[PDB]
């Protein structure tokens, strides 16, 4: 009963992560797609398929800043997380809906930030885990070699650890980034804990599936 969502030259991954090339509605009956501008930073999108089906038809859809960029991250650098793999108008950039956190000075203190769903609907939260190419990269970016990441809620629980290795160069990158996503129930808290390697949510999406 509603017009479709046209993603033009983008696919769903690039649109929803906010690939700078990918620039609205609150409702659509299906998504029209093409598969090139998706994840400009190479890596894997975990359970990508379920996210497509989950996004195919929606009745309510609002982007909101789950973690304000200038207010959420006092102990870390929220400015340096840009790359040539993700360019925006001739400049190095990054997903609009994520922030690549990076050490401040020469230490990466523990990160612990939470959010409680005060929207009256399911909230879609995305994030990434960065996987550096060398153990030297791991230190320059994150300081800590034993970096870990935990993400929890009432329905989601998972600890992440970086796998350091030399991949073949994709978009000149030897490192990799994995992308995750989960749904946060209307009364639910989501917690983030990290000693590095965490690509942080900035925008998330309040929604209703059809």
């Amino acid at each position, epitope marked *: 009963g509603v017009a479709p969502l046209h993603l033009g030259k983008c696919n769903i991954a690039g649109w929803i992560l906010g690939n700078p090339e990918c620039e609205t509605a609150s409702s659509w009956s299906y998504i029209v797609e093409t598969s090139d501008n998706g994840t400009c930073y190479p890596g894997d999108f975990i359970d990508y398929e379920e996210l497509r089906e989950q996004l195919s038809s929606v009745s309510s859809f609002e982007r909101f800043e789950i973690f304000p960029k200038t207010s959420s991250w006092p102990n870390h650098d929220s400015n340096k997380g840009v*790359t040539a793999a993700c*360019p925006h108008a001739g*400049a*190095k950039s990054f997903y609009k809906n994520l922030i*690549w956190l990076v050490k401040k000075g020469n230490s990466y203190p523990k990160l612990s930030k939470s959010y409680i769903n005060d929207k009256g609907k399911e909230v879609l939260v995305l994030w990434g885990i960065h996987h550096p*190419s060398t153990s030297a990269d791991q230190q*320059s*970016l994150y300081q800590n070699a034993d970096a870990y990441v935990f993400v929890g809620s009432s329905r989601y629980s998972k600890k992440f650890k970086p796998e350091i290795a030399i991949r073949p160069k994709v978009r*000149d990158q030897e490192g990799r980034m994995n992308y995750y996503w989960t749904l946060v129930e209307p009364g639910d808290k989501i917690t983030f804990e990290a000693t590095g390697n965490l690509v942080v949510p900035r925008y998330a999406f309040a929604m209703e599936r059809n």
Partner: antibody
Amino acid sequence: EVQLVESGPGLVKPSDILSLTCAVSGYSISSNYYWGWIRQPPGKGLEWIGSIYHSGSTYYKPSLESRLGISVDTSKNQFSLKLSFVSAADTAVYYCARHVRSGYPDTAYYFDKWGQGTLVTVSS
Amino acid sequence: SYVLTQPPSVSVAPGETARISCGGNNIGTKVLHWYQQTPGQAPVLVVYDDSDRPSGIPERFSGSNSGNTATLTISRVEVGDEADYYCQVWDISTDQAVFGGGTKLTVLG
């Protein structure tokens, strides 16, 4: 506090090998840095040559790669340059320099500590 | 190989502001570093990671990489600032460091 000093012959015949060593003092190469070479012909600009990590990984200027070797000797806290089959185009002041990894995500290096340099003339 | 282009020369009266540009295709996608070299000496790092200053470098030296030439800006120029200035990037597609051709700063008056 970290110092680097280049040494080796100041005169080399064409078709021979140019050899240099950089002795580092005040800091151990076996540490999170790359170590490399930049040269400057007299009165001209700087040209980067190559670099090495204590593990042995190297980066070479593509135009020179066929004639270049770089080695490291952690036990003496030094590294060395070998440039083969030289001609007059290789006459330059040679600098060694510590290569610092950019804090940005993408691979990038810059040179924060430099030796004073050594002149090598290639001539018959 | 990646090419960096600098103007050969900039002149400025003492106390005024000198600006040195560094052009390259999509240079905004690379990080830039800048070096100062005084007659007879080794180059000295003055700016790294586009816009950061090493310890000990006067606040007068700043760098930028917005628009699409990057720029070394030197405020309140002093005669002691006469030197050749070089920009430098790392090219990730070919795994090498590249320098611009250098700019000579002259102080007038």
